[PDB]
Amino acid sequence: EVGYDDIGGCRKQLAQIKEMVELPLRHPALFKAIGVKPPRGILLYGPPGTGKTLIARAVANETGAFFFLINGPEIMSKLAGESESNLRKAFEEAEKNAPAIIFIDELDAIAPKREKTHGEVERRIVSQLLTLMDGLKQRAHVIVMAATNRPNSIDPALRRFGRFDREVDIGIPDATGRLEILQIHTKNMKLADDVDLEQVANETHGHVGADLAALCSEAALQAIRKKMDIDAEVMNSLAVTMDDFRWALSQSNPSALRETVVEVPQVTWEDIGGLEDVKRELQELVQYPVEHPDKFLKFGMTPSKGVLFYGPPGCGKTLLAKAIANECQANFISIKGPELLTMWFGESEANVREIFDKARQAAPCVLFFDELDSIAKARGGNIGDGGGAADRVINQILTEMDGMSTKKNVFIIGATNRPDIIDPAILRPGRLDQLIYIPLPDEKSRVAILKANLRKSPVAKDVDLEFLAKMTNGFSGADLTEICQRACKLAIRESIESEIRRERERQTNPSDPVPEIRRDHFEEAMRFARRSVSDNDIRKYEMFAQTLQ
Amino acid sequence: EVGYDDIGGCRKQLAQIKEMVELPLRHPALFKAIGVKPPRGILLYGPPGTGKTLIARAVANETGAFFFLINGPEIMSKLAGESESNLRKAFEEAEKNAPAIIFIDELDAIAPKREKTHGEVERRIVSQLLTLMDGLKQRAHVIVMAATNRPNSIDPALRRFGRFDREVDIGIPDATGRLEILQIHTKNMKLADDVDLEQVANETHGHVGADLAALCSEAALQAIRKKMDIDAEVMNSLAVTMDDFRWALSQSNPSALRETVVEVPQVTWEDIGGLEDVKRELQELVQYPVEHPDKFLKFGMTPSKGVLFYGPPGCGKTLLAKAIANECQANFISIKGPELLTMWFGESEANVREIFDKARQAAPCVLFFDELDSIAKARGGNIGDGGGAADRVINQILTEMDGMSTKKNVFIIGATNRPDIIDPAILRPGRLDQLIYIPLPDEKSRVAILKANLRKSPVAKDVDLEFLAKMTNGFSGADLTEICQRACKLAIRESIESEIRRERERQTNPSDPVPEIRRDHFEEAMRFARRSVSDNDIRKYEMFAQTLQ
Ligand SMILES: CCCCCCSc1nnc(COc2cc(F)c(C#CCNC(=O)CC)cc2F)n1-c1cccnc1
Ligand SMILES: CCCCCCSc1nnc(COc2cc(F)c(C#CCNC(=O)CC)cc2F)n1-c1cccnc1
Ligand SMILES: Nc1ncnc2c1ncn2[C@@H]1O[C@H](COP(=O)(O)OP(=O)(O)O)[C@@H](O)[C@H]1O
Ligand SMILES: Nc1ncnc2c1ncn2[C@@H]1O[C@H](COP(=O)(O)OP(=O)(O)O)[C@@H](O)[C@H]1O
Ligand SMILES: Nc1ncnc2c1ncn2[C@@H]1O[C@H](COP(=O)(O)OP(=O)(O)O)[C@@H](O)[C@H]1O
Ligand SMILES: Nc1ncnc2c1ncn2[C@@H]1O[C@H](COP(=O)(O)OP(=O)(O)O)[C@@H](O)[C@H]1O
């Protein structure tokens, strides 16, 4: 017995499921009278152990309609001739009792791709499912929900309209999502109040709901370990501590890892520092078009869907993209350059189709291509010994973007660091056409940069950031954060040494730690760190701008 | 009849199995009351003949719960329709008697990958296993342990949560592990006390437990050979000698060989010699973060998970990595450069996924990439005629490291010998960012180098190491150990000649050997050996440092 309370983190997708499953069953009269056909099939997918079955059970219980789970493994387990008979009688009994939510779990196993169905019985059961789904077009209220993984894995015949009209990408839960999952799974534990259940959540990046349940179980198991060997005083005094969740997190690998995260970033224009002019430009390029479509219709100009950041390597490209995504409260589909390089090397571009389809599934998206044309940098860079500017994977990206100029809800951003090797085919209308030269931080900006970076970390009042900013003239944002991290490392090394010697003194014959960062650490760090981008590079970018501006 | 005593070397993994199999069966009450779901499936894998079946039997006998071994071969041997019936009735009788440890041996054979299951009956039995494992979710206490090899070989559907939650990488036993195995298998032998049973253990690198049992049997068989043809005086006087284990070791090839070893090194900061500053740096980069996480949380700086050693080719890179791993009592997943070159040439990067997954399975790891960007050296080196700095396999390594910044228990080390060809994509936060320029040994250091190398070998008092160190100014550590080995070779050649002439004199008409190394051998060796790294190379590394520092 579960319900809407049990599901956590899944809110947008759960909201869609609520929308799509409540009205056709709880209130079928108005749909029948109006004549609009409700979605017969609802294919919700995602990585394994994401709560697909749990979501289906919860929505079925909340609706109160008749429910009949169907599992792909058990259907396939039966002898030939009995699997299709079982499916047929399941659909029949659903029809006889039909305010109904049929649920086909692991649809991929029962109905994989056409060419990877090796046996004849496999194709027979697939066709049986097809004909049952088509024949349940009758007005009897049955909704055939299906759970799978990698929706491209199932036979595309099922994805055709009239069988599975609507798709739901559950995806990985975000930070708040993982916090909700942990709250749900740690409700009946009597956990010690010392743990927060939120510090662990932010550190469980890439964990899926099943992995979070496993982490909670492993933390409880570590709590058992800490206890020796009595029946009442051990089960009553059990209180999982933060030191137990730490162990569970350490000894628990994520499963749905390195799958492109569909999440809202958490920079909100404050992690980024100043630049005082590109914030307004990004707002006007992506905030005004959505806030005031009427004006854009009046003067008759299609808003630019693409922006290609270019500048010194590391000055706030990814930070700008994340910040503008957060301001719009939109998903941010990060695509690092290494994955594009793997795309080019793997000789497989269908994964680009997959990535763009997943971006399209997330309605408000800020699809971000970091290190764009890193493929050009790989194939000889400026020399171009491999060939011309155009290359393999960027061609597929161009095709998809040309096809993705109609969604008008996925703002594509590019962050090439070497604009001179950018293939000109992508600087065309309908593609990343708007060019914003985010420059190296200025004197007035570096103080804000350091204030943002030193945030969330104690800092003494002695340090004067203005003089440090003037001292670091041509330093890039990456170099500024490197200086901050180096100073922090020096300060923590000093603190650790102080604590070690204090403990040694206390334990020996005898029987403040400077909990702040002071200017000596900052200057010591400055001695080491140096600007990583040469004057030649910024001159080259300025020359590119002059070619444009 | 076996038990915990029989299992040897497997302690960490056996400890995990004890944890995971005792409490759910011996004390099921507290788990039921608390509500945390114990791990239903426990997939323990490793190379063949590693004791997987033996470990399962031992834990089952120690628990005392009902046990029912299931073998993949015999299940598959039955006629179609009888294999699934056999599996079903096995699960049923386990349920009827269910404090239970079901054991599916050779899970790969019964349930291989989805696409490599050719017949329809194969898929039917796989689905039968899936549905049985899902349907045994009931509170009846059955634990479905499974033994396999290369866990990527089994159908990934089984690895999903709720079926096989927990994975156990048994791995090769270490030196102490092989010693324990030999002790177990040589308990009832009446072996002669002359043999130590530990000299053989250190020389059986890559041997698996089954191979160790075979080695013991072959040693006993050689002992039989030495005996001619009586029933009592031959079986009672049998005493295997070290000369028999020597033969067995010689005529016994390892099976689980050249599989990346998950073992703790044995250098413990003493095999390495001095350098007097990078020991502290490594300690502060990997020892302080784990010892004092609270300070790292206070000042708010994510500790650097990666370090990229760079310097003259051969000065203690691998030695430093092994030493820092040993100091932390952590596994050391060595990855030599040749295997990366094979990765690049093989056109297969899924093995990089496999390597990183295996590293993640070992919780405390010091993953070490020796000769990093040797691929760059292969594709034209500094010229880069092949193309840009970025290449094929290092891209996959970068992706995995980006995904491996959350484990916070696998410290990644790189030991590039040519930093100028290192792809800059790996010198970024979240990757191998901290750079430590381990230099050529100094005058004060070479004496320690020679003291360490000459250790465990007799040395005369006449040799003066300080003058030799001054004589070898720019010599690298590889060159110093080469000098030591050459001097030892000259000394042992002299000793062998002396012994040969002494034996010849004794055997002829007539009827100290200098058991030490003296300065004449050292100077004779010095005449030959010369520094292998030129002044140009060290100047280049210094220039790289100046570009950084
Ligand atoms: C959203 C959260 C931040 C990140 C992603 C969302 S971005 C977003 N959300 N909604 C929109 C608005 O889309 C459009 C509105 C229009 F009026 C028009 C028009 C017109 C006039 N036609 C003609 O004259 C001839 C036919 C075209 C649009 F595409 N955009 C958007 C689209 C494009 C660029 N920037 C923003
Ligand atoms: C272990 C045996 C030797 C070889 C392998 C083991 S190495 C090991 N074992 N435990 C650890 C500690 O991990 C971490 C601890 C932390 F406090 C933090 C933090 C923080 C602050 N967050 C923020 O401000 C914003 C979110 C991050 C960690 F990743 N490490 C380790 C990790 C990284 C580098 N060096 C060592
Ligand atoms: N959104 C969620 N809310 C609560 N629990 C979840 C959620 N997602 C996953 N889980 C947990 O993960 C597990 C998923 O198990 P299962 O249903 O077998 O796999 P799947 O969810 O992929 O079908 C459940 O035990 C559930 O408690
Ligand atoms: N304008 C900025 N404000 C604050 N931090 C910045 C800024 N630019 C760069 N950084 C720092 O640099 C890091 C991110 O670098 P990024 O700008 O993403 O590199 P790239 O532009 O090559 O993607 C962050 O840790 C961030 O703190
Ligand atoms: N950790 C261990 N302790 C004792 N013996 C072992 C160990 N590992 C392997 N062996 C030996 O290796 C053999 C393994 O045989 P078998 O069980 O058929 O293969 P596997 O162990 O891979 O299932 C046994 O005879 C056992 O004596
Ligand atoms: N600092 C050192 N102390 C002791 N031995 C060293 C040192 N540096 C190199 N060696 C010797 O060199 C050999 C290992 O070479 P290594 O440093 O691994 O080469 P590389 O650094 O190219 O991987 C060992 O036999 C070791 O005795």
Side-chain angles (χ1 to χ4, degrees), chain A residues 223-292:
Chain A
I224 306 317
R225 276 181 175 173
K226 197 69 62 58
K227 197 163 298 324
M228 81 204 169
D229 290 356
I230 53 176
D231 188 74
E233 64 92 18
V234 290
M235 62 86 72
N236 280 301
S237 72
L238 211 59
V240 299
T241 76
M242 172 59 175
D243 290 345
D244 316 323
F245 278 75
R246 282 178 178 281
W247 172 258
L249 182 40
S250 287
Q251 200 195 8
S252 179
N253 54 0
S255 54
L257 185 60
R258 59 179 53 77
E259 297 297 328
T260 181
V261 294
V262 184
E263 72 180 321
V264 191
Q266 279 170 334
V267 286
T268 185
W269 285 128
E270 310 317 294
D271 199 325
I272 184 169
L275 284 70
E276 302 296 328
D277 62 73
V278 297
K279 273 148 70 82
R280 199 284 322 283
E281 205 84 350
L282 266 295
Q283 279 197 273
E284 184 261 0
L285 285 194
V286 60
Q287 190 68 2
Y288 295 170
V290 62
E291 285 188 353
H292 299 94

Side-chain angles (χ1 to χ4, degrees), chain A residues 256-501:
Chain A
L257 185 60
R258 59 179 53 77
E259 297 297 328
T260 181
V261 294
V262 184
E263 72 180 321
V264 191
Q266 279 170 334
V267 286
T268 185
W269 285 128
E270 310 317 294
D271 199 325
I272 184 169
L275 284 70
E276 302 296 328
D277 62 73
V278 297
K279 273 148 70 82
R280 199 284 322 283
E281 205 84 350
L282 266 295
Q283 279 197 273
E284 184 261 0
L285 285 194
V286 60
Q287 190 68 2
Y288 295 170
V290 62
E291 285 188 353
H292 299 94
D294 56 355
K295 317 305 185 177
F296 273 87
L297 296 176
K298 188 175 194 300
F299 298 169
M301 168 260 290
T302 56
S304 46
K305 271 185 56 54
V307 294
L308 178 75
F309 300 146
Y310 71 100
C315 85
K317 299 165 200 299
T318 317
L319 268 289
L320 261 177
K322 284 167 175 175
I324 193 67
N326 191 353
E327 185 67 9
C328 311
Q329 190 65 39
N331 290 312
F332 179 79
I333 307 309
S334 157
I335 291 163
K336 295 297 105 184
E339 89 89 20
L340 292 175
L341 287 169
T342 301
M343 195 73 73
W344 173 49
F345 280 126
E347 297 290 2
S348 66
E349 289 156 315
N351 290 319
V352 164
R353 161 86 273 189
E354 184 176 2
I355 289 162
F356 274 83
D357 267 358
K358 191 204 299 222
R360 202 186 278 272
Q361 286 296 334
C365 164
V366 192
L367 196 55
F368 181 64
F369 286 102
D370 187 358
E371 289 181 353
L372 188 58
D373 260 321
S374 47
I375 297 92
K377 190 151 41 162
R379 64 217 291 275
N382 206 9
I383 296 166
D385 56 355
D391 58 357
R392 207 178 203 282
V393 66
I394 306 287
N395 184 194
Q396 205 66 60
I397 279 168
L398 287 165
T399 302
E400 296 296 330
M401 293 164 30
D402 289 322
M404 196 166 279
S405 75
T406 67
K407 180 61 174 182
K408 64 175 181 183
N409 199 4
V410 313
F411 185 72
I412 310 171
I413 302 189
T416 177
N417 307 343
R418 292 213 60 212
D420 58 59
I421 54 169
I422 200 81
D423 54 338
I426 206 161
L427 274 293
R428 176 184 317 290
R431 297 150 179 188
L432 316 178
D433 50 21
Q434 292 277 338
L435 283 169
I436 302 179
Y437 166 63
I438 51 168
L440 285 184
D442 197 73
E443 319 314 297
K444 189 182 183 24
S445 55
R446 287 193 227 90
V447 300
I449 301 282
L450 271 78
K451 283 192 291 294
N453 282 0
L454 276 295
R455 211 194 59 251
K456 100 189 283 285
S457 72
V459 65
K461 323 296 193 223
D462 182 47
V463 63
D464 169 83
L465 304 174
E466 287 81 319
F467 164 71
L468 186 56
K470 294 163 62 59
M471 185 193 219
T472 49
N473 174 238
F475 280 56
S476 64
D479 295 328
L480 272 68
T481 185
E482 197 89 10
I483 290 162
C484 177
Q485 298 301 354
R486 192 76 50 69
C488 188
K489 170 186 185 178
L490 279 147
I492 189 170
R493 196 257 299 281
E494 188 274 332
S495 171
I496 289 293
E497 199 272 357
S498 178
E499 194 169 70
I500 287 291
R501 65 158 160 80

Side-chain angles (χ1 to χ4, degrees), chain B residues 116-127:
Chain B
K116 81 194 296 169
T117 52
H118 200 302
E120 62 89 20
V121 65
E122 293 288 1
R123 282 172 198 93
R124 268 169 83 269
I125 182 65
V126 169
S127 83

Side-chain angles (χ1 to χ4, degrees), chain B residues 270-275 312-320 322 336 368 370-371 415 417 438 441 448-450 452-453 476-481 485:
Chain B
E270 310 318 294
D271 198 324
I272 184 169
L275 284 70
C315 85
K317 301 159 194 303
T318 317
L319 268 289
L320 260 177
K322 284 166 175 174
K336 295 297 104 184
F368 181 63
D370 187 358
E371 289 181 353
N417 307 342
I438 50 168
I449 301 282
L450 271 78
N453 282 0
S476 65
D479 295 328
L480 272 68
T481 185
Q485 298 301 354

Side-chain angles (χ1 to χ4, degrees), chain A residues 77 106 203 225 251 530, chain B residues 16 19 128 160 549:
Chain A
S77 166
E106 304 304 319
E203 298 189 15
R225 276 181 175 173
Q251 200 195 8
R530 325 179 176 265
Chain B
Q16 280 185 153
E19 159 78 292
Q128 180 52 28
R160 285 173 210 206
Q549 159 57 250

Side-chain angles (χ1 to χ4, degrees), chain A residues 453 455-458 485 488, chain B residues 295-302:
Chain A
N453 282 0
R455 211 194 59 251
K456 100 189 283 285
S457 72
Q485 298 301 354
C488 188
Chain B
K295 317 305 185 177
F296 273 87
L297 296 176
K298 187 175 194 300
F299 297 170
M301 168 260 289
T302 57

Side-chain angles (χ1 to χ4, degrees), chain B residues 27 36 49 51 76 100-101 121 158 203 339 347 354 426 466 503 526 538 541:
Chain B
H27 285 53
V36 296
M76 294 300 295
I101 283 281
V121 65
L158 278 82
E203 298 189 15
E339 89 89 20
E347 297 290 3
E354 184 176 2
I426 206 161
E466 287 81 319
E503 288 293 326
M526 250 304 306
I538 184 165
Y541 300 134

